[PDB]
């Protein structure tokens, strides 16, 4: 029963991935293709969201160059930050450097934001970075050009977007054989766990289960005619005992 | 005002660039302005200018500011503790130590003769060791005051205890004020003495019953050796075996035995204990007042040096040039603090920059809110030019 | 019982349904026969706890995680009953949580004296005693700057009426004094609330359940002051509540109780607390008397004291399950039947 | 002795753990800061056993601390107190056994 | 003779706190550092135990007995074994939630070869 709890969790994961975009051997070989497909779907989804994050880490780095070459065309620190922490970073840097700064922000278009500091001086430059890197700000130091890193970064944006377009095509190829098959894999487990939950309710006394429970009196002869015909038609000469 | 009481001279320390101009009175010099213009012409402006020391680097300049802010607090914590003690004892004015003379010169005048004072501090020492040095002196002086005050409380405890033995109430009172050989036995093989603390009502009952109360009790031993106001103290002479039987029988009657037994060395050692407690406290008290005034004058000089250094250093950091900065300390008359703070803000704030400029003017001394109180430390608001408000 | 079911009809019948999930003596004997924490989980799954440890799966299952989740569902059931409450009932539900707010205040301002981290001294806090400025008690040390900044907008603000701040900031000795004094003023205020606005069948059986809290707190203050306190009785009498059965004659003798016999001879004159200090575990005596006072508060029907009598009985149920799961995990079974079951 | 110490220490461990949970909050962080002196210390002495000089430890119990400000809280406080007493008795034995180790 | 007075700890929370109620370790007031290290199993790193051990043996010259939970000594095993001095004495005790294994005890390991 812990097995078909785990497989129920795996069928739930397959139901979440699609929304996000029987004999004992016949169950034992289909739980194998549940597990063997859950493994590849989980690793391909975890190699896709962690790659989308790496894509956004470059699309946020292109924008803080586009919005800070423009500020110069109209001892400085340039980087990315979440938008809900811009005011608290402004206040912490204003309380650290008493004045002594020219702080801007330009919204990158989770939502994020850029910032320029102009730390006028020294001896706090490694201490501003302990404010930025504490609340998860990613500084983008360039030191060469605002037109040479953009080429080497657009040579990675498209090169990684093509890996997105490969792995997501493989994902939508895999989901075609699963979306038309989940009502079988789910409905197997929903009744198999229901079988074993009921088999936990039996006695297991002398290498044989004792099932005590209620049945209406109209359906007594139906049990005594359906249980008697079924144990004899399959062979296996060890008859059941039906007492009242 | 009426949100704060002042009755002693208040100070604001400013430092400004020597090229500055007030825009609250254009066509004035800053120095001329302080005297004539500022709070109805009633401002007393005092000299507070100090020269250049030796600065490590620009890089070093940053490290120095941070420390200065911290040491300034710490010295401030100490000087407050010394004043709180002198005030607490009420053997020295509680109405001074805000405008109590330092080096027997009135406090606004003391600041006027303050140009960077020498006690151990010279202009040819490095700035990092002056920040350190000063703080070490302040911490030593305060730790001394704390120890002697600590000792003075342990001495008060001992004097109360000892006194209680000398005449108090019978629940710990041990006898040595009665030393008679007619009320106690000593050099005795069969006899001992048990003291019984008896309620005043019950005195008659005790007098009747004691001889028969335990067996083998010296008769006509009842004498009132001592009396308090709630209890009466009796001496009884009896057999050593029979002492147990008396203490127990007495408790049933509602008498309270006080276990004491006559020996010379105990009596002498109780009188000495009382004597040493008195002597210790009295020495400690005189030492405590003498020490606290001497420590106070030295810490005052130390504290103002950090404020002078700091304001200069912070100016050097924020403004750069000119290399010598125009520092003045303004002694404000009581209740004109609110007006002072505003006029300087209006006039000089523009030099610091428009971004720097915030309005949260006003002052709340009650704990109803914590807004409206300037300090560069907080992100809530900032001073808009190098200004510290000093409240003694 | 004629005007009760207007606002309290649905509230009682669910709490009366929550009462039927209290484990009986046979459901405790069936828990003491377990061999593993997994077997105890599966035995609890047949009760009204069913599948509350389902997201654990036999590996990270400790005896503290059971006490966490079994009390967490108590707290969520209390929040469901409180969300359907209105008027005097909702105010009565708030006055229950004030006593947990006091314990979370006194647990939050001891985690800052010892400089323990603020994220780990708050997971030990009680979830029902949550107010919105509870993490911000880690901002100051002294009592005045924690009252005048944080604890004015809290509903614990009328309870700081006798806490005299002599500008000594905080040691561990006076935070317990502030805790006992806040709980003293709170017991006064909540007894006056029960006497004032709570109706008559839920008044007499709630004044006893609350005077028992006052008497237990008086005995615990007057008995813990022997070992780790050297205080005057005039300052000790500000810590003892004056609402209980024990106040006017016996808390005076508990105030000047310098010895253990000064407590024992003071509690020998009161009739229902004599014999508690003679034999056995005293904490078990108080918990047994608490459950015997909560049992006969369910026997009066149209009463809002059934909420108090339910949640204290369900807390004792979580304590009994925690004691059993502590016994069957550390393999000590000499005192596994030390649970308390009146249901 | 190792088995002895482990069993007695753990019984007292389990009693404290239950107490922490029932009282509400992680009490143990609070107690650690607040404590800054020790009752049980040792004074070391040399004992010649088998011609060699060994170091031995003799415990002395100092009365600096016996009650804190966390063993009193009111009702919750009475529980910590019952726990503290099992731990002191159990531990003192463990210190004496530890002497053979050195 | 006397040169060591403190008994220190490396142990899990419930174990450490209890040892402190019993009254055996303390925190130095001049350094602001504990003569015990709290630890929680699986949650607190192997590296920090290794430092704290060095603080207690070699930088504290006042620790008389270093007590240590068996499970915990097993994480930093090299460090406990390699220290062969009696100054401090190392006393491995069975960790809370584990029985007595005689080979999680550094002194006994050494004992087996050569009597």
Curated annotation (Swiss-Prot), chain B:
Pfam family of the protein (one): V-ATPase_C
Modification type N-acetylalanine: residues: 2
GO CC, alphabetical: fungal-type vacuole membrane; Golgi membrane; proton-transporting V-type ATPase complex; vacuolar proton-transporting V-type ATPase complex; vacuolar proton-transporting V-type ATPase, V1 domain
Keywords noted in UniProt: Acetylation, ATP-binding, Hydrogen ion transport, Ion transport, Membrane, Nucleotide-binding, Transport, Vacuole
GO biological process: endosomal lumen acidification; Golgi lumen acidification; proton transmembrane transport; vacuolar acidification
Localisation per UniProt entry: Vacuole membrane
InterPro entries: ATPase_V1-cplx_csu, Vac_ATP_synth_c_sf
Gene Ontology molecular function: ATP binding; proton-transporting ATPase activity, rotational mechanism
Chief site of localization: membrane
Domain of life: Eukaryota
Membrane topology designation: Peripheral membrane protein
Function: Subunit of the V1 complex of vacuolar(H+)-ATPase (V-ATPase), a multisubunit enzyme composed of a peripheral complex (V1) that hydrolyzes ATP and a membrane integral complex (V0) that translocates protons. V-ATPase is responsible for acidifying and maintaining the pH of intracellular compartments. Subunit C is necessary for the assembly of the catalytic sector of the enzyme and is likely to have a specific function in its catalytic activity. Reversibly leaves the enzyme after glucose depletion, causing the catalytic subcomplex V1 to detach from the V0 section.
General remark: Present with 21114 molecules/cell in log phase SD medium.
Name the record gives this protein: V-type proton ATPase subunit C
From Swiss-Prot, chain C:
InterPro entries: ATPase_csu/dsu_sf (IPR036079), ATPase_V0-cplx_csu/dsu (IPR002843), ATPase_V0-cplx_dsu (IPR016727), V-type_ATPase_csu/dsu (IPR035067), V-type_ATPase_csu/dsu_dom_3 (IPR044911)
Aminoacyl-tRNA synthetase recorded as keyword: no
One annotated GO molecular function: proton-transporting ATPase activity, rotational mechanism
Entry-linked SUPFAM superfamilies: V-type ATP synthase subunit C (SSF103486)
Major localisation: membrane
Membrane topology reported for the UniProt record: Peripheral membrane protein
Protein name (record): V-type proton ATPase subunit d
Swiss-Prot record, chain D:
Residues of the full protein shown: 53 to 154 of 256
Function: Subunit of the V1 complex of vacuolar(H+)-ATPase (V-ATPase), a multisubunit enzyme composed of a peripheral complex (V1) that hydrolyzes ATP and a membrane integral complex (V0) that translocates protons. V-ATPase is responsible for acidifying and maintaining the pH of intracellular compartments.
Locations listed in the record: Vacuole membrane
Extra remark beyond the main annotation: Present with 8500 molecules/cell in log phase SD medium.
Subunit-structure text: V-ATPase is a heteromultimeric enzyme composed of a peripheral catalytic V1 complex (components A to H) attached to an integral membrane V0 proton pore complex (components: a, c, c', c'', d, e, f and VOA1). Interacts with RAV1 and RAV2 components of the RAVE complex, which are essential for the stability and assembly of V-ATPase.
Protein name as it appears in the record: V-type proton ATPase subunit D
Signal peptide span: none
Classification lineage: Eukaryota, Fungi, Dikarya, Ascomycota, Saccharomycotina
Domain of life per record: Eukaryota
Similarity comment: family membership: Belongs to the V-ATPase D subunit family.
Curated annotation (Swiss-Prot), chain E:
Function: Subunit of the V1 complex of vacuolar(H+)-ATPase (V-ATPase), a multisubunit enzyme composed of a peripheral complex (V1) that hydrolyzes ATP and a membrane integral complex (V0) that translocates protons. V-ATPase is responsible for acidifying and maintaining the pH of intracellular compartments.
Subunit structure comment from the entry: V-ATPase is a heteromultimeric enzyme composed of a peripheral catalytic V1 complex (components A to H) attached to an integral membrane V0 proton pore complex (components: a, c, c', c'', d, e, f and VOA1).
A Pfam family hit: ATP-synt_F
GO terms for cellular component: fungal-type vacuole membrane; Golgi membrane; membrane; proton-transporting V-type ATPase complex; vacuolar proton-transporting V-type ATPase complex; vacuolar proton-transporting V-type ATPase, V1 domain
MF terms in GO: proton-transporting ATPase activity, rotational mechanism
Record SUPFAM superfamilies: AtpF-like
Alphabetic keyword roster: Hydrogen ion transport, Ion transport, Membrane, Transport, Vacuole
Gene3D superfamilies on file: ATPase, V1 complex, subunit F
An annotated GO BP: Golgi lumen acidification
Organism: Saccharomyces cerevisiae (strain ATCC 204508 / S288c) (Baker's yeast)
Record's protein name: V-type proton ATPase subunit F
Keyword Transport: yes
Entry membrane topology: Peripheral membrane protein
Note: Present with 4050 molecules/cell in log phase SD medium.
